Each structure stands twice: as C-alpha cells, then as structure tokens.
Amino acid sequence: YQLYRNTTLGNSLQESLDELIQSQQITPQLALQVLLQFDKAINAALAQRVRNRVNFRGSLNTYRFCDNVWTFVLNDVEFREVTELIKVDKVKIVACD
Amino acid sequence: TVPKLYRSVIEDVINDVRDIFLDDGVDEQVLMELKTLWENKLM
Amino acid sequence: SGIVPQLQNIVSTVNLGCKLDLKTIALRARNAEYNPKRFAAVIMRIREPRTTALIFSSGKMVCTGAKSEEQSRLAARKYARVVQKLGFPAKFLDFKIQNMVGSCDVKFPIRLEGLVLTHQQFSSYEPELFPGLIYRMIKPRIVLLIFVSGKVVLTGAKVRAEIYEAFENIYPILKGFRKT
Amino acid sequence: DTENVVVCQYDKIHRSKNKWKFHLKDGIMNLNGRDYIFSKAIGDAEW
C-alpha cells in the first residue's frame, strides 16, 4: 500500500527526492525505486514494531467509500492514548482495507 | 518511541537503496545527501 | 381509539431522467458510498430531512427514512439537486411514495396464540422464529406485526389512510384478545 | 499550521442509525503538527 507516502516521513522523503531530481543528481526512476523501498519499509515497521492502542471520539462531518477506501472528516475530535489528550477541530482519515 | 521508528526506517531504506544507487552509477555521496535532506526535513 | 398510528418510515422513488456516472458522484459528493462489486447503486445520506437514498446509474432513485410525505419529497428533491450540481441535467419525474410504515401501542397485552388460532387465514405466528404475530390484512392490503406487549407495526401502505384504516380494523380484533 | 491527517488501514467500520464506530490499525497521525503512531485505533462519532 502506497498508503504511507503522504505522511511527514513519506513527504519529507519525496521532497528530498524531487530536489535531487531537480538538480539532476538522481533520475525519476531511481526516486520511484526509493519510494517503493520506503513502502515496504514503513509497512513492515508498523506491523512488527509499533504496538500501542489509541481511542478517539468526535462528530462525523462527512464520509465516503469508493474503491474500497474510506475517507472521513471528523470535527471537534479527542484522540486518547493512555497518557491523555490530543484535541483537534478537524481531522481527515483515509483508510485502505 | 517514534523518533526511533523513523531512524529505524531511514536507516533501513538508506541501506536498502545503496546498491541501486551504485548500479545506477550514482556517487555514494548523493545517497548521503538524501539521508541528510530527509532527516533534516523531519526536523 | 384516541390511539393514532405514528408514521416512522416512507420509501419513495423518483426518476431523474438521465443516465448517471456513479463513480463521479461517489468521488465528488459528500456522504456517499459506492461499492459496485456488492451493490450497483450509490448510497447517499443527508441530515435534513434525515434520509438515505439509493441512486442507480439509470437515473432512478429510491428515498428512504423520512417520516412524512412532504419530508420524503423534499429529501428526494435535495438528492436530485446534489446530483444536479455535480453537473448532471437531472429532472424530477414521477415522484411516488411506494411504502409507508406506522407504529403504535394499544396499551395492553395480547393473547397471540389465541389470535393466530382463530385467524389462521390472515396470520401466522411462530414465537421461536420471531416474537411477533404477522397479520396480512386484505382491506386495506396492509401487513401488521403484533406483539404481546401490545405494540403494533403496520407496513405496506401506499397512502396514509391505509395505515389509519388498517389500525381501526385491527383494534377491535385485538381487544378481543386482551390479557386479563 | 497542520492538516490533521490519519493514514491507516481499517479492520471494521460500523454504523447504526447515525452512530459510527471505527476499528483501525497501523496508522500514522499528524495532529496539531506533531506525529503519532498506533497499531490499533478505536473511535466513535455521530453524523
């Protein structure tokens, strides 16, 4: 899943790659190959490494489901992780199966 | 436990693309620039 | 009875009159679900009136959940306006209420087994399967779900009068089986 | 500053009337500018 590319981790990577592409230090193909390596690496690290639980509550503003992908938008949300509170006015959630 | 995962992933990715850079004829210095650009953007 | 059946659900249909590109609608409209592999229609909801629509690529649509004829037509008009705004030349042809559901309480227990034994040609009652007795009224053509609690559901109506008429018909029959 | 986003995979999404419950996993979140991660996330929302 090329799911985790638009994350801090994934975007910083793409931006770094584009520069190198811009200054002609690497080809687009090589950049693509790096992203592919990133997908395998982030996916693998998540399932095997991280292992904590989170909880959230809020009001659902919108939902969409197409191509087996859910896209939500919650308002006034409260993300709960043992060590307490994370409050946000708006959060967008994209989820693959 | 998050900066740790990121270091972990950056290391793995950098290590895993080294040969590709080499096979492409890209100087290993460029690889290190990537890691640097990448790590600093995180900050 | 000073007992009045309350409308709980209405299903209506309407023809927008033009073929619809469902993928486009599912991707651009809010609160939409589209999974062609499981169901061929887009499922869209709105909050006022709070209802769910089923939109088919043919341009025909089903509107559900409204509690009044006017709410049903309004809701359908909104769904049609959403589709309209996404760029399709939607019309609003042959709107029509297809089914109406009502419910009420006679305020007293009922001898179901007794009712089904004497009304074998209109009802069926299998407690282990479903706790409610199913009564298929002929006039009007309405199906009622009767519970021992005294709660009653009426469905199958095309118009509000059939709901009221069916309950007026069943009330004296039910009094005949009150629990004392 | 931040576009609060959560990118993950879903186990089960559930709804009753206007009550939704989300059963999520393997997610990377960026809330208020900070970055978070979870193996599992459970949420509730009214529509």
From Swiss-Prot, chain A:
Q: Give GO cellular component annotations, separated by semicolons.
A: cytosol; nucleoplasm; nucleus; transcription factor TFIIA complex; transcription factor TFIID complex
Chief subcellular location equals nucleus
Claim: Transcription is one of the keywords in the record: yes
**UniProt similarity note:** Belongs to the TFIIA subunit 2 family.
Subcellular location(s) of the protein: Nucleus
Q: Which domain of life is it from?
A: Eukaryota
Keyword annotations for this protein, in alphabetical order, are: Host-virus interaction, Nucleus, Transcription, Transcription regulation
Record note on quaternary structure: TFIIA is a heterodimer of the large unprocessed subunit 1 and a small subunit gamma. It was originally believed to be a heterotrimer of an alpha (p35), a beta (p19) and a gamma subunit (p12). Interacts with NCOA6 general coactivator. TFIIA forms a complex with TBP. Interacts with HSF1 (via transactivation domain).
Molecular-function annotations in GO: protein heterodimerization activity; protein homodimerization activity; RNA polymerase II general transcription initiation factor activity; RNA polymerase II general transcription initiation factor binding; RNA polymerase II-specific DNA-binding transcription factor binding; TBP-class protein binding
Which protein are we looking at?
Transcription initiation factor IIA subunit 2
Functional note: TFIIA is a component of the transcription machinery of RNA polymerase II and plays an important role in transcriptional activation. TFIIA in a complex with TBP mediates transcriptional activity.
An example Gene Ontology biological process: positive regulation of transcription by RNA polymerase II
From Swiss-Prot, chain B:
Kindly list the cysteine pairs connected by disulfide bridges: none
Q: Give the top-rank taxon of the lineage listed in the UniProt record for this protein.
A: Eukaryota
Kindly provide the name given to this protein in its UniProt entry: Transcription initiation factor IIA alpha chain
**What stretch of the complete protein does the chain hold?**
9 to 51 of 376
Swiss-Prot record, chain C:
Which segments carry the sequence repeats?
7-83, 97-174
Where is it mainly found?
nucleus
Q: Binding positions for DNA?
A: N9, R45, K60, N99, R136
User: What one GO molecular function would you report for this record?
Assistant: aryl hydrocarbon receptor binding
Tissue distribution of the protein: Widely expressed, with levels highest in the testis and ovary.
Highest taxon of the lineage: Eukaryota
Keywords assigned = Disease variant, DNA-binding, Host-virus interaction, Neurodegeneration, Nucleus, Repeat, Spinocerebellar ataxia, Transcription, Transcription regulation
Compartment(s) where it occurs, according to its Swiss-Prot or TrEMBL record: Nucleus
Q: Which GO terms describe its biological process?
A: DNA-templated transcription initiation; mRNA transcription by RNA polymerase II; positive regulation of transcription initiation by RNA polymerase II; RNA polymerase II preinitiation complex assembly; spermatogenesis; transcription by RNA polymerase II; transcription by RNA polymerase III; transcription initiation at RNA polymerase II promoter
What's an example GO cellular component term for this entry? protein-containing complex
What this protein is reported to do is described as: The TFIID basal transcription factor complex plays a major role in the initiation of RNA polymerase II (Pol II)-dependent transcription. TFIID recognizes and binds promoters with or without a TATA box via its subunit TBP, a TATA-box-binding protein, and promotes assembly of the pre-initiation complex (PIC). The TFIID complex consists of TBP and TBP-associated factors (TAFs), including TAF1, TAF2, TAF3, TAF4, TAF5, TAF6, TAF7, TAF8, TAF9, TAF10, TAF11, TAF12 and TAF13. The TFIID complex structure can be divided into 3 modules TFIID-A, TFIID-B, and TFIID-C.
Provide the family line: Belongs to the TBP family.
Please report the name of this protein according to its UniProt entry. TATA-box-binding protein
Source organism (scientific name): Homo sapiens (Human)
Query: Which gene produces this protein?
Result: TBP
